[PDB]
Amino acid sequence: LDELKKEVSMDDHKLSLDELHNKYGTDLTRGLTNARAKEILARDGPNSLTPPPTTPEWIKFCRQLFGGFSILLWIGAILCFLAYGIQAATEDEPANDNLYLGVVLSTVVIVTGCFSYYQEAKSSRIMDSFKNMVPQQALVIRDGEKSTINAEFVVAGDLVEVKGGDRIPADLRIISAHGCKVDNSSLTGESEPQTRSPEFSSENPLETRNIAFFSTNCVEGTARGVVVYTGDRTVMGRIATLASGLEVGRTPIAIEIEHFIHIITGVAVFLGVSFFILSLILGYSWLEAVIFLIGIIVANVPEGLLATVTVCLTLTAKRMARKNCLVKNLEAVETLGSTSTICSDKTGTLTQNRMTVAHMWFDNQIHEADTTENQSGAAFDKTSATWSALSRIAALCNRAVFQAGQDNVPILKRSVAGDASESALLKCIELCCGSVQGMRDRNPKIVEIPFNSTNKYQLSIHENEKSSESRYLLVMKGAPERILDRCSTILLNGAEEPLKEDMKEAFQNAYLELGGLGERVLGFCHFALPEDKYNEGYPFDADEPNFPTTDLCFVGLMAMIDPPRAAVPDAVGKCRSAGIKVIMVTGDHPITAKAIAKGVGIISEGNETIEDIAARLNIPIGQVNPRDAKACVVHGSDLKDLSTEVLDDILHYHTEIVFARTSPQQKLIIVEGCQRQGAIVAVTGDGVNDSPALKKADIGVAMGISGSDVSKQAADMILLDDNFASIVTGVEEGRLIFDNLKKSIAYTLTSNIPEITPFLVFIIGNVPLPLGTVTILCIDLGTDMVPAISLAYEQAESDIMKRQPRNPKTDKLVNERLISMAYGQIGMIQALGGFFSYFVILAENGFLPMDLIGKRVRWDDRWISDVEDSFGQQWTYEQRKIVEFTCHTSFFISIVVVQWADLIICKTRRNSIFQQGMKNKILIFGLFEETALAAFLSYCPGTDVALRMYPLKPSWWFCAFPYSLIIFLYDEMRRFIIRRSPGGWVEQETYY
Amino acid sequence: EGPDNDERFTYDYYRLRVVGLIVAAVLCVIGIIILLAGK
Amino acid sequence: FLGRTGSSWFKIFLFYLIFYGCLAGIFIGTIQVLLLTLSDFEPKYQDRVAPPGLSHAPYAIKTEISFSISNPKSYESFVKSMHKLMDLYNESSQAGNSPFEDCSDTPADYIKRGDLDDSQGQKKACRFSRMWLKNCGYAEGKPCVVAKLNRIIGFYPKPLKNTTDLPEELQANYNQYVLPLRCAAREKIGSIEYFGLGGYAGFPLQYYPYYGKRLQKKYLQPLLAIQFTNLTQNMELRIECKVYGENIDYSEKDRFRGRFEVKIEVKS
Ligand SMILES: *[C@@H]1O[C@H](CO)[C@@H](O[C@@H]2O[C@H](CO)[C@@H](O)[C@H](O)[C@H]2NC(C)=O)[C@H](O)[C@H]1NC(C)=O
Ligand SMILES: CC(C)CCC[C@@H](C)[C@H]1CC[C@H]2[C@@H]3CC=C4C[C@@H](O)CC[C@]4(C)[C@H]3CC[C@]12C
Ligand SMILES: *[C@@H]1O[C@H](CO)[C@@H](O)[C@H](O)[C@H]1NC(C)=O
Ligand SMILES: [K+]
Ligand SMILES: [Mg+2]
Ligand SMILES: [Tl+]
Ligand SMILES: [Tl+]
Secondary structure, three states, rough: OOOOOOOOOOOOOOHHHHHHHHHHOOOOOOOOHHHHHHHHHHHOOOOOOOOOOOOOHHHHHHOOOOOOHHHHHHHHHHHHHHHHHHHOOOOOOOOOOHHHHHHHHHHHHHEEEEHHHHHHHOOHHHHHHOOOOOOEEEEEEOOEEEEEEEEOOOOOEEEEEEEOEEEEEEEEEEEEEEEEEEHHHHHHHHOEEEEOOOOOOOOOOOOOEEEEOOOOOOEEEEEEEEEEEEHHHHHHHHHHHHHOOOOOOOHHHHHHHHHHHHHHHHHHHHHHHHHHHHHHOOOHHHHHHHHHHHHHHHHOOOOHHHHHHHHHHHHHHHHHHOOOOOEEEOHHHHHHHOOOOEEEEEHHEEEEEOOOOEEEEEEEEEEEEOOOOOOOOOOOOOOHHHHHHHHHHHHHHOOOOEEEOOOOOOHHHEEEEEOHHHHHHHHHHHHOOOHHHHHHHOOOEEEEEEOOOOOEEEEEEEEOOOOOOOEEEEEEEEEHHHOOOOOOEEOOOOOOEEEEHHHHHHHHHHOOOOOHHHOOEEEEEEEEEOOOOOOOOOOOOOOOOOOOOOOEEEEEEEEEOOOEEEOOHHHHHHHEEEEEEEEEEOOOHHHHHHHHHHHOOOOOOOOOHHHHHHHHHOOHHHHHHHHHHHHHEHHHHHOOOOOOHHHHHHHOOOEEEEEOOOHHHHHHHHHHHHOOOOOOEEEEEEOOOHHHHHHHHHHEEEEOOOOOOOHHHHOOOOOOOOOOHHHHHHHHHHHHHHHHHHHHHHHHHHHHHHHHHHHHHHHHHOOOOOOOOOHHHHHHHHOOOOHHHHHHHHHOOOOOOOOOOOOOOOOOOOHHHHHHHHHHHHHHHHHHHHHHHHHHHHHHOOHHHHEEEOOOOHOOOOOOOOOOOOOOEEEEEHHHHHHHHHHHHHHHHHHHHHHHHHHHOOOOOOOHHHHHHHHHHHHHHHHHHHHHHHHHHHHHHOOHHOOOOOOOOOHHHHHOOHHHHHHHHHHHHHHHHHHHHHHHHHHHHOOO | OOOOOOEEEEEHHHHHHHHHHHHHHHHHHHHHHHHHHOO | OOOOOHHHHHHHHHHHHHHHHHHHHHHHHHHHHHHHOOOOOOOOOOOOOOOOOOOOOOOOOOOOEEEEEHHHHHHHHHHHHHHHHHHHHHHOOOOOOEEOOOOOOOOOOOOOOOOOOOOOOOOOOOOOHHHHOOOOOEEEEOOEEEEEEEEOOOOOOOOOOOOOOOOOOOOOOOOOOOOEEEEOOOOOOOOOEEEEEEHOOEEHHHHHEOOOOOOOOOOOEEEEEEEOOOOOOOOOEEEEEOOOOOOOOOOOOOOOOOOOOOOEEEOO
């Protein structure tokens, strides 16, 4: 469906003005007829974007109500009402058991539904942001007259007019223009104004001057044009549809959840029906056969687990909110940890998005300035008298000014009225020479010649601030070579000197080096005009050369670039140390893209492209073995004629990849290419041209300050302070939460065994029921909750940023090793500790373990109010039941006591508690509150009716203590083996 | 005692409950103290 | 295979065999020590049987015994359980001076055979003739229910003293030696008739205290036969038999705590 939109567009900028009118039945001068425009409206439809059909929240909520655990809990809830129905008909049961348990279980499903619904959130308003880029109104020429109309009423063929400050209402063929410049950052991510004129200037319509696009704005001048595309058919309207239309897809974390749901659901249905038939064979009435099944359901399903996961995710997202990293989708909290490839935009993401002075060439020396936002570098020069001469030209031969009321904000961050290069120079001098306004007050400008297309220079004449002179100084800047052809002397370390071929060659060298760094280079020179030849009232003519512009003194060079953000180089290296592959994907030109790649460490030192090898060896590129080149730089124009299989080979064959001059669909294609190889991919960006890629990414991260509204709609995560170091933190947090989920899951599952085994022995042994159904829910929904959550606050056991990204195909959240430990080893020890306390309670009340076998028949018989114990005493029905429920209560408390040790062992997968310590305060809180809850549930009056919880005698609490301790020792010995031999036996069997 | 051994079939479940609830409360307070050591 | 290789499948079996073996051996060990802390003659706790339960022979479907006099197999169900109990009180079962003893044919005081020790043989229990149960196949019309006080080791059932007012106000009040049992329903549409030891409507105190199964096997607890020769027919009659005493109490939950709940209906 969207495969059409993933392709590069076709256009009609090659046609003549006249020819273009024939195609659209239009007038170049009079414009369309009121009737013809209305006709075309009904024909083509409105100049608007329609949002894609969404899935209502209704269906979204209910889709969770049927996912493995909820299905089993539904079967339980209904099976409760089943047994209740069968009762209400047969023998009038005045009880509330099956009825209430059926109500409780149905509530558990609904509430669990809210948790998973909260986790599976999708806040997407892509198409809405795009719609915000179409103006409310447009100016059209109809019947030879200009009028404002609803922009939706704009059709292909009419004559539109735009001017500085307004949004392009539709894709236009420029037919007339006067000084028109446009901001195409929507399509390129670059905000430098692009001229628009009627002349065709490139085969590529996205590069030609005679096309203006919807989603962009006119920055200055005026233009008229013929509408060629409207609504969804515009270049960026298609990007809108592509972006808004892209299928979301399941996250890595989501896939893991479903996976263990299958496992646990599997064992549940297995043991469920395996013992349902095992009971009927033993001659159990279907009346009972279902009651046992309900218990089996409740025992096997970890009722509180899915909600635990959600809370652990939420708590991890809260910590990241506190580092200026907003998470829109709870699952995106983990994806960053599983990320193996980052596709990053350059401008406004890796870079500050601001022309900044990078180097200066004066005194036959290359000086480097500090490009960082917060200025974390050092000085370059202050002493040289040459510097002050260059500094003066940079301030004086400059027409840029700071906007009013910025004195509060830092120099480099403040808004400037002017072109990017003049702003850069302004901020450079203001920083290291103080107020520039001061320099422009001490040296009043009397005449100037602003930068001309033809002159290729800008000159200014000022009254020298010096009192002993107060004469006229000439300054000029422009193209380095043009400035050179106008110089005779060079200000070396203070004093001038003739411009010999020697210094002239050093100039060329300096010029070539700075240009090689991808930096824009300017020349600077001045000339102190002779006093006798220029009186204090001498008039200077700016129109006609009234003053010399030759034999001037060359002062120096200055170079500039849109520099990396301070934290970016280090963040890139850190991603790469964690084994994450970092690719650059930018709409910017290749020379600039490549230079920043080396600056931030995308391309490491020494690594070459095929083009680099060819130039170094002075040989044809076809003569170069492409396997000798680990780095590559792909232009979008070449990308366009490559198949995906060939794109896949590029991705496979290079470690250091730069995709430059890419369109928005091309970014999507590169992302998909990476994913196709089985990689989890993150995208980082800030422009509307990142929207499709951000949507398709497993996780999209947008910049918060510099980011466009669209990009932040398309993302899963926002960096609110533009701190790229947050990606590094995000991946670290993502890995940590993945491990801690394992700990929390194992902990929760472990207590399933002591809830399952009592029901089994109840059938096979014919003893009184050791633990009840209600009692199970008091564990999974009550006591285990806070402890399970607390594992989310566990510190790393080792340097997680030192390991490679997990293999999502092999490294699962819940594997066989977890089940073996939780179900086969620790849970089994917990089961016994439960049974022990059960036998203790009964034996101390007169029913010794031996006489318990095959007694349930008489025990449950409501009409036998005289059962004989081991000592020959006789018990009524309600009397023995009180002891039985007291058994449920102590078995319950036994679970809590054995979960104490389990909580401590689940703390660490490898390390010892004596190494990791007990610095998790939430965990300790869990221990205290868990025990408080259990005690309250046993001793609070009335709980014997609502939950069948009975007061325990002090000695009862200590039954499971020896089992709780064996768990601690056992797991500590086991992990001691793991560490002592990384070999594999204990490791490959039990290492979560 | 002999025929007056009524205490043999008696248990102070009332005191046990009072003590049990005291303990539960104090464990609840202790927990808050440790948690609130930083919020 | 599914998971691993044969070598791995073996090792995982050798482990869980030794592992579960140890766990079973430990579990058994903790059961040993538990038993080691317990007496053979007396249970550690008795507060959960404390107030004695009162149970009868007619096995009630739901605290009810409804049947038809004009039908044979209508009551043959209740006669099965009635027979089961009384079959134990046979004279052929009580033979010789061992381990039985002839006790007062009239309600007497308690009998202490020492302590709950094995320092003596089987503590000798009082004989009880089912022949003390006058009038009661059994009552084919108007049932002859048999009551019973639940056995508790070392329990001395103490009758109420005639200090103040009483339900069966002072009638045949053998204050010193009889634990009374008065059945009731207002709703007085019946005819209560009690049979027992010495002809009294109670339990003779000479059968106490019970020394337990280990120290007193073949021991016989006193019975109290109750006959309802009611002149009514074809209606549910809620009859409650209540025992009175210093050590006797009741509960709204446990409807068998020192009392009966019988729903007789001679629907004939
Ligand atoms: C306990 O006493 C009952 C009294 O009914 C015995 O029942 C006797 O059963 C035999 C054989 O079935 C009959 O011939 C008699 O008529 C019954 N009564 C009597 C008085 O002998 C019963 O057999 C006795 N049980 C034991 C174990 O001795
Ligand atoms: C109540 C009692 C009788 C039930 C005992 C169940 C035992 C036999 C179960 C419980 C957990 C189980 C193990 C759980 C995990 C694994 C790892 C997997 O890669 C192979 C199977 C294996 C090794 C299972 C084998 C059987 C097992 C040990
Ligand atoms: C009980 O049986 C005796 C004979 O043993 C008889 O005289 C008497 O009438 C019976 N009593 C009743 C109330 O039927
Ligand atoms: K995404
Ligand atoms: Mg950008
Ligand atoms: Tl469970
Ligand atoms: Tl659990």
